[PDB]
Design a protein around this ligand. Structure first.
Ligand SMILES: O=C(O)CCCCC(=O)O
Ligand SMILES: [Cl-]
Ligand SMILES: [Cl-]
Ligand SMILES: [Cl-]
Lengths: 297, 294
């Protein structure tokens, strides 16, 4: 059905969704479902001229994300022949039974679109829902939660979007848009300070963060006025000490805790005064939110 | 942007679709490289540096995706890498067990590693969760199967990982088997009518029909349905369903699904049903924690 309508492109861009990446994801997903042939079940049991109303409804409480992409799927499958009666916005809180979308379209085309629409909605809503749980554990502090490059293959930009819809902040998108010095770079470079100085000199225009595993490495990069330091697998007490040394250096380096973190210790870490938590699980281990598509009776 | 014959051979020996795997790998590398080169490593790691690297598990689980991770490394290095040691997909790993030992240019490992690990940790996570469902079903004849609730773009690799965890696949897509769902019956008005229409249309294609009530079950058992999916039946309703199937004396295979979770898996396996269809295997599998250490 080759590409959807410009109205759908505008809705994707209005939402901050990368439209070319979303097209690749959608076209690929439909292909996974249709490469063995037409929908035999529906073609045998549903008339070609049937049209129906359908409701996308949540079965669990959580945060909605990906509804513009699901509409792009339906737009593509129907060639634009659908009408929306009702829709919630990405970022909205849903409870069980809440209706996220009500649409009318040819019944056979809804049956083809349904599973691709839901696989996208449920995963992205699951990401935004988990992100919101982490963000809520940070209430009462100024701490924020951030994601990582531990995304699922092919879904990076959509999952980064979902993290934003859940109240999280995006970490860098790839290897070339920001520096993140890690232990292999510190070993190679000769010290934490040497790696930090080499990165600053090689690409002075990029954001620069250095990950440390010890308080000794932290002292080095504070002495060089690093803008942002990732504290790798620090205990809560080591974070308090790290924050103490940061406050005394009066460089106002941002501190980001990472590694060894779970939702039940997130509030404890935020209380130490670190500025950020970096959480891989937001994208690599987010349980899907259970949404279903139900035809009108 | 092509890998070696040795990799095509590896993927085929494993039963992995190579064209799909190429699409997944190339797409995933582009996600990481579209903003420019690995500026961090280019500033700090010598261009001539070479290192051995170990993929090791931090947690117990089942390995899956290792030939795909090697295809990533093959592409990034242009074939310039040495394998010293490898486990096989489907092997059980414990903490510290070494899945893979390779030697390559250090900068190329640093470009390859996160793509390799995103694939390896996800697919091993799918296989690991599948294996836990299989363990809960041990001592019964009930088997676990997956579904079309796969992450977009990852269907064939995720279905592969379910098999490596000891699970069954059913339909790969919409076209390869008939599965009459609740929405088909809503649209038609009758579960028995939908079954007969499907049977008539393509007599040799096996029909599975999904029911939500014991009265619907009665209706399709009377028509001699070959396979019935019990949608959101409780444990007690499945026992009742097995009873009515036995009383109707049909050979109908019974499958249960609908929000199934691991803490009730072992109970559902003792209802008499033949299969549990579990969406969570593919849409809610926690990643297996694997790391790559120089
Ligand atoms: O949408 C389909 O084609 C199958 C969906 C199975 C029912 C569900 O959403 O739980
Ligand atoms: Cl935004
Ligand atoms: Cl950044
Ligand atoms: Cl196999």
């Amino acid at each position: 059905a080759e590409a959807w309508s410009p109205a759908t492109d505008e809705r994707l861009r209005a939402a901050g969704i990368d439209a070319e990446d979303a097209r690749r994801v959608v076209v690929t997903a439909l292909e996974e479902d249709l490469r063995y042939g037409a929908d035999v079940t529906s073609d045998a049991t549903v008339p070609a001229d049937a049209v129906t109303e359908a409701v996308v409804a949540s079965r669990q409480p959580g945060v909605l994300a990906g509804l513009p992409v699901a509409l792009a799927v339906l737009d593509l499958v129907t060639g634009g022949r659908f009408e929306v009666a009702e829709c919630r916005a990405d970022g909205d809180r849903l409870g069980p039974g809440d209706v996220a979308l009500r649409v009318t379209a040819a019944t056979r085309e809804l049956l083809v679109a349904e599973r691709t629409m839901l696989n996208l909605l449920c995963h992205l809503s699951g990401v935004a829902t988990l992100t919101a749980r982490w963000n809520d554990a940070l209430a009462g502090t100024h701490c924020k939660v951030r994601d990582s490059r531990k995304t699922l293959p092919g879904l990076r930009l959509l999952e980064k979007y979902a993290v934003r819809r859940g109240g999280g902040q995006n970490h860098r998108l790839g290897l070339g848009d920001a520096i993140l010095i890690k232990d292999n770079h510190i070993v190679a470079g000769g010290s934490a300070g040497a790696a930090l100085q080499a990165a600053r000199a090689h690409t002075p225009g990029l954001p620069c963060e250095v990950e440390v595993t010890t308080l000794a490495e932290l002292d080095e990069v504070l002495a060089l006025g690093a803008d942002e330091v990732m504290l790798d697998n620090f205990t809560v007490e080591q974070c308090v000490e790290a924050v103490r040394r940061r406050d005394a250096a009066r460089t106002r380096t941002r501190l980001e805790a990472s590694g060894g973190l779970t939702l039940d210790v997130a509030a404890a870490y935020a209380r130490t005064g670190v500025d950020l938590l970096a959480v891989g699980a937001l994208t690599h281990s987010a349980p899907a939110l259970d949404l279903g598509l139900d035809f009108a009776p």
